[PDB]
Amino acid sequence: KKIFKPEELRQALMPTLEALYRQDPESLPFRQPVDPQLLGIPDYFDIVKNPMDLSTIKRKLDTGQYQEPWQYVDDVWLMFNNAWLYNRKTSRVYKFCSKLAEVFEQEIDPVMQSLG
Numbered sequence: 001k002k003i004f005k006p007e008e009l010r011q012a013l014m015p016t017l018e019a020l021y022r023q024d025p026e027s028l029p030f031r032q033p034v035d036p037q038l039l040g041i042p043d044y045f046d047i048v049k050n051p052m053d054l055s056t057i058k059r060k061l062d063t064g065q066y067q068e069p070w071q072y073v074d075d076v077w078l079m080f081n082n083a084w085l086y087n088r089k090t091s092r093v094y095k096f097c098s099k100l101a102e103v104f105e106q107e108i109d110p111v112m113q114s115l116g
C-alpha cells in the first residue's frame, strides 16, 4: 500500500483544517472539545460516545497520528456527525456544522486527488 509521510499528510491536509478554522461564526463551537459541564449539557457524553473537535484533529495531525488521509477525513466527519446527532436541527451548532461540512467537502476533494 502507499505509505504517507507525516509531513506529507501535514502539508496536504493542514490547509483544509485551516479552511474550517477560518469560518466565522461557524467554526467557533468546534475549535475546542465540548465541555458539557461549562456548557450546561450534562447529557452530552451519554449521546456522543466519541467526541471530536478541530483542536484534537490539529493535534493529531501535528503528532503523526494519521497514517492515511482517510483517517483524517474520518475524524472531521466524526466531529460533524456528533454535532448533527446531538443538536436540534434549528440550533446554531447544527446549522454551523452543515456550513463547515460544505466548506470541507470543497477543500478536501482536490487535496485527495493530489494525495495518493
Ligand SMILES: CCc1c(C(=O)NCc2cccc(Cl)c2)[nH]c(C)c1C(C)=O
Residues within 6 Å of the ligand: 028, 029, 030, 034, 039, 041, 044, 082, 083, 086, 087, 092, 093, 096
Ligand atoms: C451547543 C453546545 C456545543 C458547542 C459550543 O461551543 N457551545 C457554545 C457556543 C459558543 C459560541 C458559539 C456557539 Cl454557536 C456555541 N460546541 C459543540 C460542538 C456543541 C455540541 C453539543 O455539539
